[PDB]
Amino acid sequence: LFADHVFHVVDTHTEGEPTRIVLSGVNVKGEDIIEKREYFKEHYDWIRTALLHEPRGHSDQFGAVLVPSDIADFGVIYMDTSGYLDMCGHATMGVATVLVELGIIEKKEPYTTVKLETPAGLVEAKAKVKGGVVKEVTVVDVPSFYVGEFVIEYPGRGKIKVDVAFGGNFYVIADARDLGLRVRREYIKELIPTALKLIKVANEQIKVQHPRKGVQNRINLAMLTDEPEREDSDGKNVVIWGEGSVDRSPCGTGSASRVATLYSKGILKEGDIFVHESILGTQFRIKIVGTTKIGEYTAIIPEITGSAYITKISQDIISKNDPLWKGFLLR
Amino acid sequence: LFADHVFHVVDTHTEGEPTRIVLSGVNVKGEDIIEKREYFKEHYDWIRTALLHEPRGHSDQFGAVLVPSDIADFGVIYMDTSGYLDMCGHATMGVATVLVELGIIEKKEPYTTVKLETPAGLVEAKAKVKGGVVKEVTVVDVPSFYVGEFVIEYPGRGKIKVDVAFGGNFYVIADARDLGLRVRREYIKELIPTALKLIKVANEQIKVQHPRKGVQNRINLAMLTDEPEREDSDGKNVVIWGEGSVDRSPCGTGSASRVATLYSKGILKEGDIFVHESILGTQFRIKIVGTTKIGEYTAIIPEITGSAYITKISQDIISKNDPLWKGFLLR
Numbered sequence A, B: 001l002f003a004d005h006v007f008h009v010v011d012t013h014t015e016g017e018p019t020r021i022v023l024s025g026v027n028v029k030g031e032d033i034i035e036k037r038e039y040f041k042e043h044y045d046w047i048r049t050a051l052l053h054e055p056r057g058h059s060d061q062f063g064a065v066l067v068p069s070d071i072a073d074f075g076v077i078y079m080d081t082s083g084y085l086d087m088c089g090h091a092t093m094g095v096a097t098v099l100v101e102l103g104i105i106e107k108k109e110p111y112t113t114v115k116l117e118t119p120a121g122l123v124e125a126k127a128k129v130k131g132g133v134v135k136e137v138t139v140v141d142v143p144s145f146y147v148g149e150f151v152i153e154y155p156g157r158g159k160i161k162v163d164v165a166f167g168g169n170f171y172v173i174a175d176a177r178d179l180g181l182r183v184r185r186e187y188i189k190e191l192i193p194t195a196l197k198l199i200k201v202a203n204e205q206i207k208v209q210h211p212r213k214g215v216q217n218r219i220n221l222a223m224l225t226d227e228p229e230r231e232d233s234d235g236k237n238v239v240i241w242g243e244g245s246v247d248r249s250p251c252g253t254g255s256a257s258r259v260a261t262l263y264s265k266g267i268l269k270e271g272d273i274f275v276h277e278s279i280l281g282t283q284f285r286i287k288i289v290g291t292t293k294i295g296e297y298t299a300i301i302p303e304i305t306g307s308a309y310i311t312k313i314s315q316d317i318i319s320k321n322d323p324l325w326k327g328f329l330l331r
């Protein structure tokens, strides 16, 4: 009686990073996922802030919209508090858990598998299921590659050595101590502004280019590395983008990009596995299960593994006279 | 199949400030609300972090647990990301909306009224209902009073003039420019640390005392005032407590406390109304509908008015093997 709109949203976290997964209330027209995403940006961007800004989300929230697909089981429009990324690791893990545990897809075998049409390419998600429960998901991310290292001018700091790779989005990778901080919990209200400028600066000097239609040709996310805290861990990192959003997970698509750097640098060979640590201490693992050619960059095929957990099953309500229905932030 | 625990949580916002209101899964034993609250702190504090920390909440979230009452319609255990306040304005407005719009209480008249047993006293909530919709709620908050002004030592700043009042919790009120900031959106990552120390410092020098059993005798929240941005507004403020939680509303119980200061300072008379502005620009209105005696302080009876809106209706899920079921934060 009190609702103007109602959305079926199921939440997950993936090593701490939330995905608000929406399963009703969004009809979207389009030939493929890139078209459907543009049709979403035009008519439906208000849903994105109503669901990930406050009060229904928060400064760091994340969303994925299930849509149909002719070329896959479903398509996925990834969205965050600022915009729409071409791919995302943790949200795919979360979509695969919901898709299974809620019985939308046939549970099967030890692994039940989902093909997903994503902006940056078709993405296979392999979920290990015990009983009804998905215990972990392995994402066969899209081909990732190294673009180059660069000496960029960072004001107040001089010249910084910086890597730039693509793991479904383009990333600026840079060691934190090179810019005067350590990625630990305490440096966060300093890590956000630094990493944010690192994206502005990097996109002025460096240019990137992905051959695929719809993949945006700018560095959209910043990744700052440091020594991990745990013994299992090969590397720590925090990924920061948009207006200050901070990945609570080791970030699948960025981790993919890092590994593709270490592959070109020879540090990692095909078949080797890497373990990444978030600023939270949670971890992913990436195997280099293959190689292929993207445009004419040499690309790894990375396989991110982790686990996601349903945390909420919601009917998100837009109440009649809610002056703040659209969502707000203060960061 | 995938759930160890399940909670029926209904969200509201009140001028932007969320209340996660829980309606199932909590049996609590106790003679009154103070006993039931202690029984909650002992066995059930894990629910509080699982519901307001991440990933089910966030840095700024708020909760209220409905429990039975012999002396009222219900009792309410208020909780936040740090602890449990004795009273809270916006959560009561939110509980009254849910209690009506969901048909838990008989909708009636122009106003349908609810009596609530809260830690700091019995609290009447009057909801204006159009059709099914609650358009606003008026909270007859508990008797509020002025305790004194004080010259406290704030390191790095010298001596600050500071007021201390009780509006259901004790507050440190202090002008922001007196401590070198302006309460606007941009000063928030500086307003949190300042206001936080202002609570540590204030509680070392100043002592407070409320005669009622269960009302904690410490200043629990800090309120920093400045010139408002809007013309309707009599005063702007931001309320900050716990480990950095920031009120997105003008804060009912603190606004009550401010008014009780302005009443003793004579600036406001009985019957006058005040309009408060949050750091978000949202507003409450308080009338001084009466006076009474608390212990032997002279106390106003403040009536906070605003509106709250259901934003989510959730089944909060604790999944089987979720290492992070209990909740985490990074601020």
Ligand code: PRO
Pocket (backbone or CB within 6 Å): A017, A085, A087, A088, A089, A090, A091, A239, A247, A249, A250, A251, A252, A253, A254
């Ligand atoms: O896990 C990931 O890859 C996502 C991408 C954006 C934020 N973190």
Ligand code: PRO
Pocket (backbone or CB within 6 Å): B017, B085, B087, B088, B089, B090, B091, B239, B247, B249, B250, B251, B252, B253, B254
């Ligand atoms: O509106 C209020 O009064 C609540 C009290 C704690 C935070 N804000």
